[PDB]
Design a protein around this ligand. Structure first.
Ligand SMILES: CCCNC(=O)N1C[C@H](N)C[C@H](C(=O)Nc2ccc(Cl)c(F)c2)C1
Ligand SMILES: *[C@@H]1O[C@H](CO)[C@@H](O)[C@H](O)[C@H]1NC(C)=O
Ligand SMILES: *[C@@H]1O[C@H](CO)[C@@H](O)[C@H](O)[C@H]1NC(C)=O
Ligand SMILES: *[C@@H]1O[C@H](CO)[C@@H](O)[C@H](O)[C@H]1NC(C)=O
Ligand SMILES: *[C@@H]1O[C@H](CO)[C@@H](O)[C@H](O)[C@H]1NC(C)=O
Ligand SMILES: *[C@@H]1O[C@H](CO)[C@@H](O)[C@H](O)[C@H]1NC(C)=O
Ligand SMILES: *[C@@H]1O[C@H](CO)[C@@H](O)[C@H](O)[C@H]1NC(C)=O
Ligand SMILES: *[C@@H]1O[C@H](CO)[C@@H](O)[C@H](O)[C@H]1NC(C)=O
Ligand SMILES: *[C@@H]1O[C@H](CO)[C@@H](O)[C@H](O)[C@H]1NC(C)=O
Ligand SMILES: *[C@@H]1O[C@H](CO)[C@@H](O)[C@H](O)[C@H]1NC(C)=O
Ligand SMILES: *[C@@H]1O[C@H](CO)[C@@H](O)[C@H](O)[C@H]1NC(C)=O
Length: 340
């Protein structure tokens, strides 16, 4: 077996159900093939391969997919794009993401890093070859990574350049923390419940691994200092509704009598700034009754403050400036190569 580094157009595979009206199933039924019924993972013995999650074309490929999934799936009452206004019908839709497998065509193969504490760049000594990645849910989110996979041993810090403060940091947790978001039966006010004990325990460990990477300086968390609501708030879609939740209680440092349930104030917003970059979208008011979603916090997006090089401290705020890193945090151990 011999291969070289290569980019190629991938196809997608799903367990999408053709009878479903849910938009991710609708999309993957007409835009993906069925899941590999006999997927074979092939260990490459005493091969060491280099990987680079920040320089990986599958990320931009998955990105183009999720954009076209959202363009076909969501129907706003009004789109505000490039100085024109298009207004269509905005019926409520069924929204619940499903895992998407990414697969190489003929003559290419996907390599998978399996070293447990791989950080995303550098050599991997435990390499396998696969035909499709594992099922990845396209969870659109800010501040927290939701419903993703877990690191298998220690918590991992991922960055293209930790000494560059403009590069987003991906925190891969080894322990999921549940975040239970409810809009009960003003109709836009909602709330997310988190186990404070669980979260403060994990974040303590996040601080200790960050301190391992910032030469034992004191690690401080802070809320985002300004921006649009999509930045200052943890946003996500629960059943077609766009939730905006204040996380200031999560990135508090004293709790690093607060060991019970954190209750995060949330609001369902009709008008949003589109993460596609294309502008302002307006949706209809939320459905009647209780809107609940229980998700797994599996990672944190952090950007570190600048100008503290002569300081005792490093101060980190939640979030990043590109949906692509959400995809990166599940595609980090994957690499396409051309078979030579
Ligand atoms: C001229 C600029 C237009 N710009 C935007 O409209 N922006 C600016 C930035 N590129 C990305 C921002 C974002 O994160 N939106 C979002 C929407 C829904 C969910 Cl569920 C979510 F988690 C996040 C939105
Ligand atoms: C390499 O990874 C495999 C698959 O995840 C796992 O069984 C173990 O960590 C390693 N095994 C060998 C033989 O290196
Ligand atoms: C990733 O691992 C390499 C060693 O292979 C190391 O040089 C690099 O700094 C690591 N990245 C981070 C963000 O720690
Ligand atoms: C998670 O990682 C930390 C170190 O990063 C470690 O102390 C802790 O035991 C790990 N937890 C689990 C459940 O593996
Ligand atoms: C990381 O960022 C710092 C400051 O932004 C820069 O001086 C350094 O050259 C960068 N390292 C790499 C490997 O690009
Ligand atoms: C949440 O994480 C647990 C393990 O931490 C896992 O068993 C469960 O399936 C996850 N839930 C979702 C919706 O991914
Ligand atoms: C989520 O919260 C609601 C109300 O706060 C509660 O009724 C429900 O049982 C909770 N679910 C889980 C899994 O904690
Ligand atoms: C938080 O997790 C602990 C274990 O870490 C568990 O015993 C407790 O029930 C949880 N508390 C809440 C409020 O969910
Ligand atoms: C950082 O702190 C730990 C404390 O456990 C210590 O073992 C380690 O040697 C320190 N490293 C540096 C470079 O100060
Ligand atoms: C989050 O809540 C705090 C008070 O708990 C408030 O001061 C802050 O302005 C809120 N964030 C936003 C973006 O409104
Ligand atoms: C995470 O997965 C659970 C179970 O599939 C789902 O109910 C929940 O809505 C998901 N969260 C998000 C933000 O998609």
């Amino acid at each position: 077996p011999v291969w070289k580094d290569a980019d190629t157009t991938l196809f997608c595979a799903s367990d999408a159900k053709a009878y479903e009206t849910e938009v991710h199933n609708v999309w993957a039924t007409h835009a993906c093939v069925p899941t590999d019924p006999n997927p074979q993972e092939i260990h490459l013995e005493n091969v060491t391969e280099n990987f680079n999650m920040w320089k990986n074309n599958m990320v931009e490929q998955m990105h183009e997919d999720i954009i076209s999934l959202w363009d076909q799936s969501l129907q706003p009452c009004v789109k505000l794009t490039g100085g024109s206004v298009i207004k269509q019908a905005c019926p409520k839709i069924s929204f619940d993401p499903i895992p998407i497998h990414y697969c190489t065509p003929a003559g290419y193969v996907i390599l998978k890093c399996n070293d447990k504490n791989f950080n995303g760049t550098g050599p991997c000594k435990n390499v396998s070859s696969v035909q499709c990645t594992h099922g990845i849910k396209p969870v659109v989110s800010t501040q927290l990574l939701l419903n993703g996979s877990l690191a298998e041993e220690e918590i991992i810090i991922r960055s293209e350049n930790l000494t560059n403060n403009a590069k987003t940091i991906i925190v891969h947790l080894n322990k999921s923390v549940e975040i239970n978001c409810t809009r009960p039966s003003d109709i836009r006010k909602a709330y997310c419940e988190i186990n404070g004990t669980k979260w403060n325990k994990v974040l303590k460990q996040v601080t200790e691994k960050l301190k391992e990477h910032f030469n034992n300086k004191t690690i401080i968390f802070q809320p985002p200092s300004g921006g649009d609501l999509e930045i200052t708030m943890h946003t996500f879609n629960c059943r077609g509704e766009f939730f905006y939740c204040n996380t200031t209680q999560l990135f508090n440092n004293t709790c690093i009598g607060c060991n019970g349930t954190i209750t995060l104030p949330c609001k369902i917003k009709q008008i949003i700034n589109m993460w596609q970059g294309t502008g302002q979208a307006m949706y209809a008011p939320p459905i009647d009754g209780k809107i609940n979603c229980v998700s797994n916090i599996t990672g944190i997006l952090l950007t570190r403050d600048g100008g503290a090089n002569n300081t005792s401290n490093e101060t980190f705020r939640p979030g990043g400036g590109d949906m692509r890193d959400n995809w990166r945090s599940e595609l980090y151990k994957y690499k396409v190569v051309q078979i030579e």
